[PDB]
Design a protein around this ligand. Structure first.
Ligand SMILES: *[C@@H]1O[C@H](CO)[C@@H](O[C@@H]2O[C@H](CO)[C@@H](O[C@@H]3O[C@H](CO)[C@@H](O)[C@H](O[C@H]4O[C@H](CO)[C@@H](O)[C@H](O)[C@@H]4O)[C@@H]3O)[C@H](O)[C@H]2NC(C)=O)[C@H](O)[C@H]1NC(C)=O
Ligand SMILES: *[C@@H]1O[C@H](CO)[C@@H](O[C@@H]2O[C@H](CO)[C@@H](O)[C@H](O)[C@H]2NC(C)=O)[C@H](O)[C@H]1NC(C)=O
Ligand SMILES: *[C@@H]1O[C@H](CO)[C@@H](O[C@@H]2O[C@H](CO)[C@@H](O)[C@H](O)[C@H]2NC(C)=O)[C@H](O)[C@H]1NC(C)=O
Ligand SMILES: *[C@@H]1O[C@H](CO)[C@@H](O[C@@H]2O[C@H](CO)[C@@H](O)[C@H](O)[C@H]2NC(C)=O)[C@H](O)[C@H]1NC(C)=O
Ligand SMILES: *[C@@H]1O[C@H](CO)[C@@H](O[C@@H]2O[C@H](CO)[C@@H](O)[C@H](O)[C@H]2NC(C)=O)[C@H](O)[C@H]1NC(C)=O
Ligand SMILES: *[C@@H]1O[C@H](CO)[C@@H](O[C@@H]2O[C@H](CO)[C@@H](O)[C@H](O)[C@H]2NC(C)=O)[C@H](O)[C@H]1NC(C)=O
Ligand SMILES: *[C@@H]1O[C@H](CO)[C@@H](O[C@@H]2O[C@H](CO)[C@@H](O)[C@H](O)[C@H]2NC(C)=O)[C@H](O)[C@H]1NC(C)=O
Ligand SMILES: CC(=O)N[C@@H]1[C@@H](O)[C@H](O)[C@@H](CO)O[C@H]1O
Ligand SMILES: *[C@@H]1O[C@H](CO)[C@@H](O)[C@H](O)[C@H]1NC(C)=O
Ligand SMILES: *[C@@H]1O[C@H](CO)[C@@H](O)[C@H](O)[C@H]1NC(C)=O
Ligand SMILES: *[C@@H]1O[C@H](CO)[C@@H](O)[C@H](O)[C@H]1NC(C)=O
Ligand SMILES: *[C@@H]1O[C@H](CO)[C@@H](O)[C@H](O)[C@H]1NC(C)=O
Ligand SMILES: *[C@@H]1O[C@H](CO)[C@@H](O)[C@H](O)[C@H]1NC(C)=O
Ligand SMILES: *[C@@H]1O[C@H](CO)[C@@H](O)[C@H](O)[C@H]1NC(C)=O
Ligand SMILES: *[C@@H]1O[C@H](CO)[C@@H](O)[C@H](O)[C@H]1NC(C)=O
Ligand SMILES: *[C@@H]1O[C@H](CO)[C@@H](O)[C@H](O)[C@H]1NC(C)=O
Ligand SMILES: *[C@@H]1O[C@H](CO)[C@@H](O)[C@H](O)[C@H]1NC(C)=O
Ligand SMILES: *[C@@H]1O[C@H](CO)[C@@H](O)[C@H](O)[C@H]1NC(C)=O
Ligand SMILES: *[C@@H]1O[C@H](CO)[C@@H](O)[C@H](O)[C@H]1NC(C)=O
Ligand SMILES: *[C@@H]1O[C@H](CO)[C@@H](O)[C@H](O)[C@H]1NC(C)=O
Ligand SMILES: *[C@@H]1O[C@H](CO)[C@@H](O)[C@H](O)[C@H]1NC(C)=O
Ligand SMILES: *[C@@H]1O[C@H](CO)[C@@H](O)[C@H](O)[C@H]1NC(C)=O
Ligand SMILES: *[C@@H]1O[C@H](CO)[C@@H](O)[C@H](O)[C@H]1NC(C)=O
Ligand SMILES: *[C@@H]1O[C@H](CO)[C@@H](O)[C@H](O)[C@H]1NC(C)=O
Ligand SMILES: *[C@@H]1O[C@H](CO)[C@@H](O)[C@H](O)[C@H]1NC(C)=O
Ligand SMILES: *[C@@H]1O[C@H](CO)[C@@H](O)[C@H](O)[C@H]1NC(C)=O
Ligand SMILES: *[C@@H]1O[C@H](CO)[C@@H](O)[C@H](O)[C@H]1NC(C)=O
Ligand SMILES: *[C@@H]1O[C@H](CO)[C@@H](O)[C@H](O)[C@H]1NC(C)=O
Ligand SMILES: *[C@@H]1O[C@H](CO)[C@@H](O)[C@H](O)[C@H]1NC(C)=O
Ligand SMILES: *[C@@H]1O[C@H](CO)[C@@H](O)[C@H](O)[C@H]1NC(C)=O
Ligand SMILES: *[C@@H]1O[C@H](CO)[C@@H](O)[C@H](O)[C@H]1NC(C)=O
Ligand SMILES: *[C@@H]1O[C@H](CO)[C@@H](O)[C@H](O)[C@H]1NC(C)=O
Ligand SMILES: *[C@@H]1O[C@H](CO)[C@@H](O)[C@H](O)[C@H]1NC(C)=O
Lengths: 125, 445, 124, 121, 51, 53, 53
């Protein structure tokens, strides 16, 4: 029984095999006065937060899957720790802190070299 | 060579429409627990680095007189002021005859009042101006408030100030706001220096009549824009290069005395006035106004009006329109302003002293909104406020004059024109990213 | 990095490279008379995006950007060649010559998709 | 509007072409609050089922097949007895009390189906 | 669900949840008094005799 | 006179509405989690080991 | 209804009016209304005919 927010502080590679145990609760928006206006402005946050990440996922590679790879060559300006250190004795929370300043720079290079694939997909035909 | 069709997500198409806009502030209100009228605290903070983007190889039509976003600006200010005046003290049982005595600009009006305890009579006195009280008699000194007939007079909330801090309007996501800063913009025409912005700059929600204060200066030179110069009833909006400044105050030092109406409601008024009494005045420096007026008439002689122009004062009649409205520190001014237009332009005082009276009970929002009157509470001490004149509202007079061109009157008397002088270069569009185009692709499947 | 609404009046071919720069900054912006205006305009962007997110999600696309359709381009509407539309007009210029047909175009692009879903379904 | 709730009384096999004309129209002062609450309600009706469709097989299409066994405890009508002499209104009235246990069955062997792609990669 | 090998810096004197908690109790009690009887003509003289 | 005739508008607690505090539960919307430190003898400000979501 | 008159405004209090007739001009009459015979009982006959079931 893993549950929501299971191996969070555990090994990064250990959590890399258990993505679906906590990704389901981010999904499943099915259902199965002061606080009337508190519900209205917070139920819209349920559809804002869920759909706010399904736009970025569907653009890059991920249509209906959780692990989609791209062709960005992983530039060396940011952190370049080896495989045996990132996936063995480090956690996801620690990883995002070291790379937080470069999340937008890494992201903005992913939608490009994706239209370069989409245009090459159309031009091939 | 058969052609198929393909779709495209991310196509820039504008086809402008109408939406509902945001509110943004600069988050510079370090003074906490102020909570001014326009709810600047209740707007989204933290919008730094307004990264504008330049547009090139683009032509599209800007409009200002047919704009509907300024209607939303005028709709908010009616609602913003009306909702602020609701949840505080009303003073409606003050529609009583007043036995006043001259003390003069101000009066020593006294009346019988009933306290919070019923069936009690207390002899309390306040101070009112001539613009707030009217008599219904022949020569008796009885007085009553100006708007007691078919209107409700409420008191402005005392702990909420009237400071004109700027706010920023923003369209919702997916709606873009365009702007034109091409030099010497006509007002209604295509633009070339088009630049999309995330959302517009800081509007100043100050209310004024016959002039414009704390606006944005012109980019190159003094520009004049209108819809048609041949019509008599259409307004004229101007913009200045060099801002005209006023260093003025209101020496009327006094103290505020709390007079009970009531069941938890409190009526504020000035009491024992202290010092030598003086009237409200403002200095406008010469060699900076007629020099400014010299720049205005340089292209007022251009191909809209030919020659023999002349400046005149207001038409007169209804007092609430013809004078120049003013507001600083929580007090509303209604000022004599004929001395700035007593000249003729055709081809020794240092400063211009404008006399001005004070109107505590205003009726400005009632005649357009019907929300109600407003009793401005007195402000302790002597107040001083300095502002820059950045625009004027001029209106020609209809008539016949064979020898000369018709006169110019400054009595525009409108509310929507006060916000079109700064929103003159903004336009809201909706971005639908869809679009189709042919190519050579078959969807192999 | 041309920014949001960058090469918008530019060449068709250049505008075919930066479709996605107008997609990431489309719904994610900054986040009681101002409060109701805040709420009634924030939800106005969510439902407007979903109004034409189905339109991508029905015809040919699932979540992708440039998906092909088998509509054979009937010659009733504008018949400019490949070297004309992709060379010296912008997207705003192209939308002015096709705007009234989109009622007939959209109901035809969604057509020949149910005709396609059967072909994959019966083959299995 | 042309065929909104269209051939609902016709042959069950005539629903092959009429899905699009219906799926296209799932989203088209205290009085404004009541009017706004209906607008956000339609945002929940649609996309509350698209999240469901986005789970199992139908991410962006209308017809997706599933490898569930479809046992014979419920009705045993064949392909001809279902797709020709029946309407969808009558069809959903027969499996109305069984679709609750049906919906969790497609989820079974679906998260397990998502495991092999991770296992392969 | 419990969490293992986890650390986090907590606080309770600057928590924003209790600040929202104070906002409701003001609002719920104030809204409960509006749409029924008021008693404002009562602040009058009261001839009071001790029982 | 009544004690509150200063600076207050005195209303009446509404007769058909009770004051009984029935327990309520505060709950975060989807996409938000609440962290609970159920460790024994919590100091008030500092690290916690038995953090439960 | 023959009731042609000039309405009067009564100063109830601060900024309020009370419109009531006090100046009726002409001759007083009771308000009558026509319902045409040979058509209403024609309808009433049709009402009971379908009630004969
Ligand atoms: C056009 O814009 C100008 C801006 O220069 C504006 O003039 C200012 O008006 C305000 C209105 O009250 C004047 O009062 C100030 O209000 C601010 C509000 O936060 C106060 O902080 C100021 O206090 C300062 O000074 C105190 C000493 O007297 C300090 O103790 C205190 O810490 C502050 O530093 C002050 O009360 C303000 O003085 C003027 N500014 C100038 C330069 O004259 C004008 O009103 C605008 N036009 C219109 C028509 O409103
Ligand atoms: C206004 O008229 C009053 C007369 O009622 C003048 O006298 C004041 O009367 C009140 C009421 O008893 C006293 O509390 C004040 O102390 C009186 N004033 C003085 C100076 O003795 C009053 O002077 C007049 N002028 C003003 C500015 O109030
Ligand atoms: C059209 O107007 C834009 C302004 O919106 C010009 O961009 C600015 O040009 C000035 C040159 O005087 C620069 O100092 C600014 O830095 C420019 N703005 C930015 C954001 O960089 C643009 O140059 C104008 N076009 C032409 C051809 O002059
Ligand atoms: C505002 O001030 C001007 C300037 O004083 C007023 O114009 C004067 O009006 C009086 C009326 O009695 C005349 O006697 C003066 O001759 C006028 N001045 C000049 C220079 O001619 C103006 O009337 C004032 N506004 C109002 C509404 O009275
Ligand atoms: C009004 O005009 C004055 C002077 O023309 C402006 O004061 C200058 O403002 C600029 C930028 O805001 C500063 O760089 C200068 O240092 C200011 N001058 C002085 C002498 O300090 C003022 O900003 C204008 N606007 C307002 C609202 O007062
Ligand atoms: C961390 O907290 C959890 C509960 O929040 C503890 O789990 C409980 O432990 C007690 C033992 O005292 C058992 O009686 C309960 O049955 C447990 N709860 C459940 C749901 O099984 C856990 O022991 C705590 N761990 C530490 C190290 O303090
Ligand atoms: C109603 O009663 C009044 C008496 O209270 C009649 O007399 C009117 O009285 C008022 C008040 O003094 C005068 O202004 C009117 O001029 C009186 N009427 C006439 C005709 O003289 C009044 O006539 C009665 N009827 C109506 C319809 O008002
Ligand atoms: C018919 C038409 O619009 N032609 C234009 C014109 O600018 C020119 O013939 C060509 C290349 O310069 O680009 C295209
Ligand atoms: C996580 O905690 C468990 C508890 O016994 C321990 O066995 C495991 O080694 C820990 N893992 C890490 C990466 O600290
Ligand atoms: C990597 O980042 C550095 C830092 O700016 C930059 O100079 C370099 O060109 C980048 N290289 C690649 C391949 O992106
Ligand atoms: C993590 O574990 C590795 C291998 O056991 C070792 O380098 C060390 O114990 C940890 N790494 C660091 C940087 O402390
Ligand atoms: C990230 O950028 C900020 C800039 O405000 C800087 O203070 C911080 O040190 C940066 N992070 C790292 C890990 O260098
Ligand atoms: C009301 O004020 C006037 C002012 O002189 C006074 O004569 C009159 O007696 C007052 N009324 C009462 C009831 O005291
Ligand atoms: C009112 O009476 C005084 C006293 O004689 C007189 O000076 C004044 O002129 C009169 N006012 C009017 C308008 O008759
Ligand atoms: C009542 O006040 C209005 C103000 O709009 C005024 O025009 C009217 O003359 C006043 N009535 C009387 C009888 O003076
Ligand atoms: C400005 O626009 C008006 C109408 O929009 C036009 O009549 C006038 O000639 C224009 N002025 C220019 C282009 O200088
Ligand atoms: C301006 O007025 C003239 C005549 O007074 C009229 O012909 C013209 O159409 C007006 N301008 C506009 C934009 O309507
Ligand atoms: C207005 O006052 C400021 C503050 O001292 C001063 O710098 C400025 O020169 C004054 N301007 C005029 C016209 O008096
Ligand atoms: C204004 O009046 C107050 C109180 O009457 C006094 O303290 C202050 O000194 C006065 N201002 C001046 C400039 O004298
Ligand atoms: C403008 O005003 C200045 C004030 O000193 C004066 O010297 C100058 O002659 C005036 N010019 C005109 C054209 O009135
Ligand atoms: C201004 O207009 C009025 C209106 O009658 C006129 O009497 C006066 O002479 C005009 N002023 C000038 C300087 O022409
Ligand atoms: C206004 O101009 C006229 C011109 O004849 C002059 O007689 C009068 O004194 C001027 N008034 C003021 C206040 O400048
Ligand atoms: C776009 O503008 C550039 C500016 O130099 C120009 O070279 C180019 O030809 C223009 N393209 C179009 C399609 O107008
Ligand atoms: C193309 O459209 C026209 C008019 O809409 C129609 O008459 C013609 O039959 C269509 N051709 C094809 C092949 O669909
Ligand atoms: C599109 O059809 C409408 C319908 O009448 C018409 O007004 C418009 O001119 C048409 N557009 C083009 C580019 O022909
Ligand atoms: C047979 O049908 C029942 C439905 O009642 C189902 O629960 C069961 O799993 C089915 N058997 C198999 C082997 O799938
Ligand atoms: C189950 O199937 C058999 C034959 O396959 C059929 O005779 C029977 O009627 C079916 N059960 C039901 C409840 O229809
Ligand atoms: C189809 O169903 C109806 C309804 O029971 C029945 O009357 C008819 O005979 C059936 N036809 C066939 C061919 O099964
Ligand atoms: C569906 O199943 C339920 C099980 O409780 C039953 O009560 C109901 O009658 C059934 N409906 C049918 C057979 O139409
Ligand atoms: C009511 O208010 C007055 C003035 O604020 C104060 O003097 C009085 O003491 C208050 N009542 C009581 C009972 O304290
Ligand atoms: C509790 O926290 C305070 C400040 O956060 C600290 O001063 C104190 O030493 C702590 N007590 C402990 C850890 O027992
Ligand atoms: C009723 O009285 C009004 C009073 O002005 C009059 O205009 C009207 O003609 C009268 N009605 C008839 C039918 O004469
Ligand atoms: C209905 O009333 C009319 C009156 O004109 C009469 O002639 C007719 O006979 C009546 N019909 C019946 C059925 O009573």
């Amino acid at each position: 029984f893993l549950g929501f927010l299971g191996a969070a502080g555990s090994t990064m590679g250990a959590a890399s095999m258990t993505l679906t145990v906590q990704a389901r609760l981010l999904l499943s928006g099915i259902v199965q006065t002061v606080w009337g206006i508190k519900q209205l402005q917070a139920r819209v946050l349920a559809v804002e937060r869920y759909l706010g990440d399904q736009q970025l996922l569907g653009i890059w590679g991920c249509s209906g899957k959780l692990i989609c790879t791209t062709a960005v060559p992983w530039n060396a300006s940011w952190s370049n720790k080896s495989l045996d250190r990132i996936w063995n004795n480090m956690t996801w929370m620690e990883w995002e802190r070291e790379i937080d300043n470069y999340t937008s720079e890494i992201y903005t290079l992913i939608e490009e070299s994706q239209n370069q694939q989409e245009k090459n997909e159309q031009e091939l035909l | 060579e058969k052609l198929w069709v393909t779709v495209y997500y991310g196509v820039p198409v504008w086809k402008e429409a109408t939406t509902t806009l945001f509110c943004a502030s600069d988050a510079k209100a370090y003074d906490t627990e102020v909570h001014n009228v326009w709810a600047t605290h209740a707007c989204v903070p933290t919008d730094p680095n307004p990264q504008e983007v330049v547009l090139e190889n683009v032509t599209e039509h800007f409009n200002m007189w047919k704009n509907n976003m300024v209607e939303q600006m005028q709709e908010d200010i009616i609602s913003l002021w009306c909702q602020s005046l609701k949840p505080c003290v009303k003073l409606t049982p003050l529609c009583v005859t007043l036995n006043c005595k001259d003390v003069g600009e101000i009066k020593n009006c006294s009346f019988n009042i009933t306290t919070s305890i019923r069936d009690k009579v207390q002899k309390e006195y306040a101070l009112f101006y001539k613009l707030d009280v009217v008599p219904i008699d022949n020569n008796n000194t009885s007085y009553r408030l100006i708007s007691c007939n078919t209107s409700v007079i409420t008191q402005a909330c005392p702990k909420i100030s009237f400071e004109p801090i700027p706010i920023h309007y923003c369209a919702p996501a997916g709606f873009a706001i365009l702007k034109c800063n091409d030099k010497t913009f006509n007002g209604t025409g295509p633009c070339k220096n088009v630049s999309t912005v995330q959302c517009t700059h800081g509007i100043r929600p100050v209310v004024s009549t016959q002039l414009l204060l704390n606006g944005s200066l012109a980019e190159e030179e003094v520009v004049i824009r209108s819809d048609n110069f041949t019509n008599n009833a259409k307004t004229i909006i101007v913009q200045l290069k060099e801002s005209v400044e006023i260093n003025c105050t209101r020496p009327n030092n006094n103290t505020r005395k709390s007079i009970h109406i009531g069941p938890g409601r409190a009526f504020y008024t000035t009491g024992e006035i202290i010092g030598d009494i003086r009237q409200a005045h403002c200095n406008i420096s010469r060699a900076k106004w007629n020099d400014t007026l010299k720049q205005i008439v340089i292209k007022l002689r251009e191909q809209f009006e030919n020659k023999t122009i002349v400046f005149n004062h207001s038409s007169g009649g209804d007092p609430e329109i013809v004078m120049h409205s003013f507001n600083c520190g929580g007090e509303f001014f209604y000022c004599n302003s004929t001395q700035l237009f007593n000249s003729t332009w055709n081809n020794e005082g240092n400063t211009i002293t404008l006399p001005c009276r004070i109107k505590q009970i205003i009726n400005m929002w009632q005649e357009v909104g019907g929300c109600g009157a407003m009793y401005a509470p007195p402000i302790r001490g002597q107040i001083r406020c300095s502002s820059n004149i950045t625009g004027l509202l001029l209106t020609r007079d209809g008539g016949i004059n064979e020898n000369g061109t018709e006169i110019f009157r400054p009595g525009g008397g409108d509310m929507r024109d006060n916000w079109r002088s700064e929103l003159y270069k903004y336009k809201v569009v909706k971005i639908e990213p869809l679009g189709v185009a042919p190519t050579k692709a078959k969807r192999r499947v």
